[PDB]
Amino acid sequence: GLLVLIWSNDKKLIEEARKMAEKANLYLLTLETDDKKIEDILKSLGPPVKILVLLEDTKDADKVKKEIEKKARKKNLPVRIRKVTSPDEAKRWIKEFSEE
């Protein structure tokens, strides 16, 4: 049970992560609507799902980091956040979590 979340408004980061996660039969979401989209999909995974989050260091990123981790504790879901800007690094972190 591995879920991927990413909030970086880059054209290539988002697109690259989609393909790589899809390759390992994962699901990734951009952070805009959390409660409705994320819970629906994560509930479809089945077992206790571990969430791998990519948060690029942007101005707003601190509020999203806040909301993610607050909801992480609230919804008792294992979440690991990495601040990365790189399509290659993204592909790595995703795939290293895909092998669980």
Residue with tokens 């972190």: 93
Dihedral angle sign, alpha carbons of residues 16, 56, 35, 26: positive
User: If you compute the radius of gyration of the chain from its CA atoms, what whole number of angstroms results?
Assistant: 12
Q: Where is 92: in which H helix or E strand?
A: helix 87-98
Domains present along the chain, CATH in parentheses: 2-98 (3.40.50.11230)
The number of angstroms, rounded, from the C-alpha of 3 to the middle of its chain's C-alpha atoms is 6
The conformation of residue 60, written as its DSSP 8-state character, comes to: T
